[PDB]
Design a protein around this nucleic acid. Structure first.
Lengths: 106, 79, 93, 97, 81, 97, 108, 93
DNA sequence: GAGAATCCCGGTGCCGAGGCCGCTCAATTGGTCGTAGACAGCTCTAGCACCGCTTAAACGCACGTACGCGCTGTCCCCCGCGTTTTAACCGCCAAGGGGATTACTCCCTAGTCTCCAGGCACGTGTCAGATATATACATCCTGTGC
DNA sequence: GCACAGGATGTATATATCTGACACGTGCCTGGAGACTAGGGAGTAATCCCCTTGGCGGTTAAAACGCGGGGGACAGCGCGTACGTGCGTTTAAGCGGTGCTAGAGCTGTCTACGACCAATTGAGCGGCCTCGGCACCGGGATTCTC
């Protein structure tokens, strides 16, 4: 039986444990550490795909495009703060206009 | 003529992607110089990876690691 | 033969969205994203394990690391669900 | 005999550019520049196809991030026009030396 | 509550500005710069105290704080030994 | 009596501080500041003195770098006087929020 | 059979055995070659020697004898290659750089 | 029992400037500098060797690490002195 | 009030994103042992708290002066558009050159015991500021008269 | 109103004292070096196949160019105002002194968690296949705009 099932998770605790094993970090690795690592990657992936799915549902699209990924990652200020040094392939820019760049009055 | 390959409407496209209304005319050659010093860094950062890998063609993954080394990491090209 | 997280991220999505599709280059965005975050958290874990003269990797130093590299309301939520996951793994020994 | 106001068509192409996300540099001259700067280091360097696209998406990303900050620098000087001293202002304040 | 943010006195922000080479300082900048001091302060000391609570120490030593400066790329010398 | 032109002694204390090496803030208000801003994360938390000195020289280096950058931002804006928008512009261009 | 270390056998003054020891249990790789500790000893020797040349020249410009960290700050920051090498560092008891922008002077 | 680089760097400045004192705060600057340079070059050489799928650190990838990290003119001086050091090491005859 | 320029909707393939079978390594299971971390104990360093006097430093008020800023006419150099040309873009052939992939073999480097001296930690002999007398000698301040 | 004589005073420069901050000679211990062993990692080499760079040619949006004009940078100039200067009046770091006392750190000892080896089975990777989501082309409603 798979250890991802006994942890109730859908990311590969064996594979990330194996990658951590040749990950060359220390001489010994505990058993619960890939479980906790799998859990935090699962929650973080669930939230970013939740925002991507909501952005897809806002713009009538049922396929994820990296433009929708950029709109999903840059609108949330927390994920913007964590992904501040990272750019996205075919991402695009959020439409932001300073208030006097718009001409005229009223 | 090969040096001037990035054309004036391309700086116009990048500037209006940046969202700038009015552009002064002395921008463009110094912006070309900005390109020829910025991508200078990553060509140096990538061909050393290539020659240490005993290869003489570059690929996506090593220049993505070069961008990751110099702080502006990119997704979607492996890595 | 190369490895990725195709079926797993796809099962996460089909759990939360049974109708949205995924482009392969968008999935490569997510793959580079997830192993980038993995490499940062694992490198910080390696450092902070060596910092306290401990030769072992465990749950407490990745715990401290995921508080410190994930900021607010993605720190405490991830810590809560991961503690839930490790407790439901240890109880189901 | 109609002539449009300066600021109408320009602002509408900023909007049409901001909704779009396609590459703005023509790929073949950029390909020429990256080859001609690469051959100064090691002659006969073959190039993988998506490496050129990775370099292109990096340089549009970095120039857009520079141009937004330089627009902020220019609008801070009570001006609607950028200038090369605003370019070096943004480069010093970015800490790019 | 107390005179703790404003305990960093008004000529001190002036002196720190004169260390950088300014001439003219407006009067309304002092509370804003005090805000800048404090907002840098919590997101350095949160890394410092997370390093502290992993060590099971309830005093903060001089080593975990300089690695907390090493965290965001603002590394410091002198207390590293 | 005889006075000096305003700004002539300003540069004198500029070169006096830039000639100097020592620290320009009293230790006790800093110490109460870190005690009353660190107690929310954890109560009864003691401190190493040289850790307080590390916090000192780190934050004073950040403030002198930020004030130098803000002086450049102000002098680009056809001024010498430094305002709130100079701080906002500088914090936008170093990248931190 | 009595032989000395491999630091002088490499003609170097930093301990190649100590930096080798840090290369094993620094767990950077499970396998370490023989030329890696002598090469790393050599490059640390070169950078340290360059730093003390600049610090000694700064101290002789100040005609002192003991290296104050003011001398280290002026040794690092008045040389451009160390400015790109040590851009984000802060040196304890170091102070700042003597610089005046030309507009700030009373140009009259 | 403590570890440092105090005596070695001490004879480094004595072999070129014997009439020069050293301060222990300055010596802490120097120790932190050599430790930071060591850990930077070693972790980047390790990451670069992980690129190659090479499990062994040899001199070639750390001189590659010199060329990546250290600025170019002092980088070529450093690799020149490193090559004469390793050739003088290799002459065990 | 007109009119290019937008959004919005109907018809065309199509070609790149989900299902479907083989099966190969790679996650998973069971037994062994040694070691690194977990808990107890004890010491000493040094961290906190307060007394008390000091004084450099900060707060507060009055002034006044260089600079921030609102306006105003001036270029004048940037912006919208026809026209051509021109180099980018696309389809596709090729070929050969370089990454990939298996296999064998050496050699190079991890692991272990011995030792002894390299590099410490910890005492003492050896040069720079500070206070102090001393005594003539040049120089300045001060009282006085023509 | 100005020149002359008497008193005061720095002061210079040589010792003596006198303290305070440095480089150098011995325990010591522990980790680097040497010898031996073992095994697996990289080096090399031969082939395979994939892709990558030219190389045409058609063709086509796009850039270069110039012309008319118009909004924005810009030097100047007044005007007020806002921060620099200065000095009386607290004041609160600061030093240092002491008193206490709790926690950092080192050692000891156990034990329990996981590296490691032999065996297992399953599930995800990949070639192959299907098909429908959507960019694209053409026509109609609608929006700022001069």
């Amino acid at each position: 039986q798979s250890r991802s099932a006994k942890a109730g998770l859908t990311f590969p605790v064996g594979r990330v444990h194996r990658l951590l094993r040749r990950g060359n970090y220390a001489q010994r690795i505990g058993s619960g550490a890939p479980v906790y690592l799998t859990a935090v990657l699962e929650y973080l992936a669930a939230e970013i795909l939740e925002l991507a799915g909501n952005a897809a549902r806002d713009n009538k699209k049922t396929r994820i495009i990296p433009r929708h990924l950029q709109l999903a990652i840059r609108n949330d200020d927390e994920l913007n703060k964590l992904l501040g040094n990272v750019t996205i392939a075919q991402g695009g820019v959020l439409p932001n206009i300073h208030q006097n760049l718009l001409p005229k009055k009223s | 003529d090969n040096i001037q390959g990035i054309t004036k409407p391309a700086i116009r496209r990048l500037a209006r992607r940046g969202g700038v209304k009015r552009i002064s005319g002395l921008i463009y050659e110094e912006t070309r110089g900005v390109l020829k010093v910025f991508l200078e860094n990553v060509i140096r950062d990538a061909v050393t990876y290539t020659e240490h890998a005993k290869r003489k063609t570059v690929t996506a993954m090593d220049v993505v690691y070069a961008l990751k080394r110099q702080g502006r990491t990119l997704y979607g090209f492996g890595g | 033969r190369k490895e990725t997280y195709s079926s797993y991220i796809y099962k996460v999505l089909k759990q939360t969205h049974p109708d949205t599709g995924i482009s392969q280059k968008s999935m490569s965005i997510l793959n580079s994203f997830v192993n980038d975050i993995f490499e940062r958290i694992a490198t910080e874990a390696s450092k902070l394990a060596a910092y306290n003269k401990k030769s072992t990797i465990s749950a407490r130093e990745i715990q401290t690391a995921v508080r410190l590299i994930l900021p607010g309301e993605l720190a405490k939520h991830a810590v809560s669900e991961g503690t839930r996951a490790v407790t439901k793994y240890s109880s189901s020994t | 005999p109609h002539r449009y106001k300066p600021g109408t068509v320009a602002l509408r192409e900023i909007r049409r550019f901001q909704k779009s996300t396609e590459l703005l540099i023509r790929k073949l001259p950029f390909q020429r520049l990256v080859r001609e700067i690469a051959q100064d280091f090691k002659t006969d360097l073959r190039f993988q196809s998506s490496a050129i696209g990775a370099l292109q998406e990096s340089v549009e990303a970095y120039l857009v991030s520079l141009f937004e900050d330089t627009n902020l620098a220019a609008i801070h000087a009570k001006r609607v026009t950028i200038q090369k001293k605003d370019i070096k202002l943004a480069r010093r304040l970015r800490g790019e030396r």
